[PDB]
Structure formats: structure tokens, C-alpha cells
């Protein structure tokens, strides 16, 4: 019930798009490989790419990622314990300036969830937010996060342009997901992380890329459960976004919802900036 | 006794020196950082240092290294294990086209002593080679390391030109160190060793940076005991080289032996290249 609209490749100005960033929240790096992930992002080509829930430990990587392409500056993070469990990657074309992970706290920095790298121009953060849990059992804590997670990115943004992407865990508006009304009291749309995602844009300040764009456009989701067949109905979540500061979007291209790549129960994101 | 000659920063050809290297053995990472190790090097404001027996697990490093000026890229290896023992770093102004560890061989990449990092025109090897030990009892395995050290820079240099820094425990010939005669069957100037230096340079095929400059020069060590304050008499090795592939002698400006500058049992090598 959704179809993404054909990709803008120049900004507003006419600037043709010169950086390509894809976000995916692969649910295992290893299930995705073996579901032709990798495959699917050689096609797309993209300068940047960040992933979430790769669940893969720093020292067992597969060996089809030092395979890529131009993505051969690959920095990774892993919960520093168990494995199987959260874990970014961000996959680069270009050598950033300066790669750091986490937020700056120390209780926060624990399950391999956020790494920055900056360039010239912008500085990239990638997130896997904390989920709220079953029976909202981790929302105080995801509610101490966000607070955490607002300061430190409020502090980057104070030096240079962001740009945050991945998993942000939450669904910001009715407008982000299929069934709003009986997901009041679910992760992913309490109105606490609600609140924390508004407070987000407006304090450090971010903008929505994708609802920026699209602002009144509604069944655009990057998330459907596996149950039940979710994805063939479209009864989806956003949860996935890129966040820009104001002062890129004379930069933004595009935002896209890569709706039909499999792989999976994320579907990738993908953004064009003109920078 | 000796007294290294001014520094020669351009080429044969007259080309300003745009690369300059330091590689130095600093005997325990946080010792060395305690004797102001971090101030020489800020005087001597290298492109890139490689250092050796840094003695420090990668996720305990020093503070201090975080500070660097434009020396912001920096790449450890440590054994896997046990601390306090073995261990290199490679620190660049400019981020490397590619960063490697070890020598492809496992049973000789588990003692953190070798980084490889590539650039545009160049590939740079820091190393710190297995000592032979007390009564000789790692000969056996030194010479099977330099056989496998000379295979996997065979391959290097058949694609790129190439660097190759650190420290080599050997002392090639008699002019290297000041007590030949007593040293014949100690580890660092057995004929084993010294042959297998030897072939090193004829098969990949290297040129002695500071040998080639200055053939006849003697008393010119890295090396000094701390016993019987040996550096005070000059009774020293030169265990610390820059090799290079022929290709690169005419970008050699000069090949430099830092005899005064404390922190550790040996001194630091400097050396320019025009690139
Ligand atoms: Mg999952
Ligand atoms: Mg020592």
C-alpha cells in the first residue's frame, strides 16, 4: 500500500547528490549475508553504510566484508561481553577524520550501540536505541538513554552538522505505523519515547529527513514484524530514520524507504546529501 | 663517539622531503610516555611513528596518545594474551588506504609485532622481530620467522613499493655493532641471523636506508644495554632499520639515528623521503 516515490537525485538548488548513505537494521549480519544482503548493497552503491543488530562480535566478522567494495573503512562495535546481541557497523568509502563510539557514558556505552565518524564537512552518528521492552519493562531506562543521547548529540551538532541515522526505536506519530491506537502501551509508541524523539528534533535541533520531505504522506514504515506475515499487509513501523540539522537541508536530495529489499525484518533506508 | 650528520631534507634530485618517519623501540609504552617520549616526539613532528614493545593491551592504552597533534591515526597490535610483553603501533597524520596485522601466517601473528599499512604510493611495515633469546633457545624459530618475514614482504613489494621500519634484532655486519668478536653467538649477531638479514635485502630485494648513505660510517647504533651505562661508552647494535625497495632510493633524502634523545634502551630512527 505504499510505493516510494522515484529517487531526487539533485538538492534544491540543482546540486546533484555527491554523498549516498544506507542505513539497515540487519537482524544478525550473518542471517542477512546468507539472505543476499551484501548483495543487495553492491547494488546500491552507497559512500556510507551504517548497520544495526549485526549480533556479531568484533573479532568474528565474516570474511565476505572484506570483500566490498568502495566500503573498505569498516568500523564496528559489539556489546564488550555475550554476543548475539545489538551491534553496529558503519562501512565507508572514504577514511572519517576521527571514528568514536558511544555516547560518552559509560553505562551507556555497554551494548555496542553507536558509532561517530566525522568528515569534512558533517559528522555521522549511527544508532541501535535501546528497545523499551516487553511489558515496557527497559522504558525507564530507555527514557535515561534519550536524555543522554540528546545531550552528547546536542554537543556534536554545536561543532559541526549531523547526521544521525539507524534504528531509533521509536515511532514518532500516529502517521508512523499501522495501528497507532492499540500500540499506545507497546515499545515503540509510548508517549515517553514519543516525547523523547520530539524533544530530540527540537533540542539539538534535528529535522525528520524522510517527514520533511513527506511530510502528509502516510503507510511508509521500515519495520514489520516476521509474525503473521506483517510486511505482505503493510502493518509496519518507521523506526528508522535520518536526522539532519537545519543546516543541511539546503544539502538534502532525497530520503529513502527501500521498501521492497528483503534480507531482514528492517528494510534499508537511503539518503542523498549534495554536499 | 659518534655524531650523527645533519639532517639532508631533499632528494638527489633537489625535491623537498614530504614524508618523514620515526620508528622507535620505546621499551614499555607508559614508561617511555613517563620519560616525556610524547615531548621528543612533538619536537620531531613525524608523518607517521611506529613504535615497538609497546607492552600495552590495545584497550589500555595511555591517555596521552588520544592528545596527539597530526598524528590522530593510530593503529595498535598487542599479543592476545598476556600483557607487558612485545606489542607495535603505527600513528599517521594521513589515514592509510589500508592497515593489515601480521605477516599472513598464523603461528607468527600471535605476539602483536607487526602492522602493515598501505598508502598512495607506498606501503609501510613496522616490526618487531622475535629476539633469538638467552643461550640462543628461539634461534630455531627466528630463523623459520625471517623465512616467513621474507616471503609475505616478497609479496608486498612485488605490487607496491615498499618500508619497512623497526626493529629487526640483528645486527647485519660487524660495522653494526661495537663488540663483534664477542657477540658471534649471542642472539643479534649470530651468523644465522645475519644471514637471514642478508637475504631479506637480496630477495624482495631492500637497500639499508642508512647503510646505503653512509657505507663506511662505524659506531652508528640504536641499541645500547642499560647495564654498565653502555650508552655512555657507545658500546651499542643497530637493531633499528629503514629498508627500502630500490625503486624508492631516488626519494630517499636521509636516514637519520636520533643518538640523543632518552626513554628507552634504544633511540629513535628518523627518515625522509620525497614522494
Ligand atoms: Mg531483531
Ligand atoms: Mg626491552
Known amino acids: 500500500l505504499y510505493e516510494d516515490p522515484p529517487d531526487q537525485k539533485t538538492s534544491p538548488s540543482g546540486k546533484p547528490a555527491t554523498l549516498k548513505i544506507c542505513s539497515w537494521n540487519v537482524d544478525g549480519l550473518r542471517a542477512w549475508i546468507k539472505k543476499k544482503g551484501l548483495d543487495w548493497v553492491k547494488e546500491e552503491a552507497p559512500d556510507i553504510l551504517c548497520l544495526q543488530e549485526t549480533k556479531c562480535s568484533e573479532n568474528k566478522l565474516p570474511a565476505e566484508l572484506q570483500e566490498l567494495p568502495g566500503l573498505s573503512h569498516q568500523y564496528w562495535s559489539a556489546p564488550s561481553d555475550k554476543e548475539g546481541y545489538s551491534g553496529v557497523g558503519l562501512l565507508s568509502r572514504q577514511c572519517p577524520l576521527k571514528v568514536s563510539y558511544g555516547i560518552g557514558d559509560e553505562e551507556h556505552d555497554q551494548e555496542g550501540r553507536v558509532i561517530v565518524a566525522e568528515f569534512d564537512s558533517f559528522v555521522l552518528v549511527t544508532a541501535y536505541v535501546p528497545n523499551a521492552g516487553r511489558g515496557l519493562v527497559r522504558l525507564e531506562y530507555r527514557q535515561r538513554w534519550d536524555e543522554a543521547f540528546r545531550k552528547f548529540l546536542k554537543g556534536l551538532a554545536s561543532r559541526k552538522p549531523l547526521v544521525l541515522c539507524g534504528d531509533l526505536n521509536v515511532a514518532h506519530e500516529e502517521i508512523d505505523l499501522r495501528n497507532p491506537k492499540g500500540n499506545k502501551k507497546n515499545a515503540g509508541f509510548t508517549p515517553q519515547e514519543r516525547q523523547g524523539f520530539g524533544e ?47 543546516s543541511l537541508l539546503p544539502a538534502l536530495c532525497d530520503s529513502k524507504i527501500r521498501s521492497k529489499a528483503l534480507g531482514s525484518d528492517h528494510c534499508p533506508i537511503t539518503l542523498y546529501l549534495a554536499l
Open 200 to 246: 530530540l528534533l527540537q533540542a539539538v535541533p534535528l529535522a525528520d529527513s524522510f517527514r520533511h520531505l513527506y511530510p502528509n504522506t502516510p503507510y511508509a514504515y521500515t519495520f514489520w514484524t516476521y509474525m503473521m506475515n506483517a510486511r505482505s499487509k503493510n502493518v509496519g513501523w518507521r523506526l528508522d530514520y535520518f536526522l539532519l540539522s537545519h
